[PDB]
Amino acid sequence: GILSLALKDKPALYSAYMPFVKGGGIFVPTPKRYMLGDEVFLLLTLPDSSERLPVAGKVIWTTPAAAGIGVQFPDGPEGEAVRNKIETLLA
At 17, give phi and psi (nearest 5°): -75, 140
Q: How many CA atoms lie less than 13 Å away from 3 in the CB half-sphere?
A: 23
Q: Which residues of 15-42 are buried (b: 16+ CB within 10 A; e: fewer)?
A: ebbeeebebbbbbbebeeebeeeeebeb
| Alpha carbon 3 to its chain's center | 10
Between the CA atoms of 13, 86, 54 and 59, what dihedral angle is there, to the nearest 10 degrees?
A: -70
Resolution to 1 decimal place, in Å: 1.9
52-63, strands of its sheet edge to edge: 3-6, 39-45, 52-63, 68-72, 25-29
CATH number of the domain that residue 73 is part of: 2.40.10.220
Q: CA-to-CA distance for 45 and 51, rounded, in angstroms? A: 6
Domain count, the chain: 1
What technique was this entry resolved by?
X-ray
Query: What residue numbers bound the domain in which 30 lies?
Result: 1-91
Dmax (CA) for the chain in angstroms is: 33
Q: CA-to-CA distance for 87 and 43, rounded, in angstroms? A: 17
Contact 69, 53 (CB under 8 A): no
Alpha helices in the chain (DSSP H): 10-16, 77-90
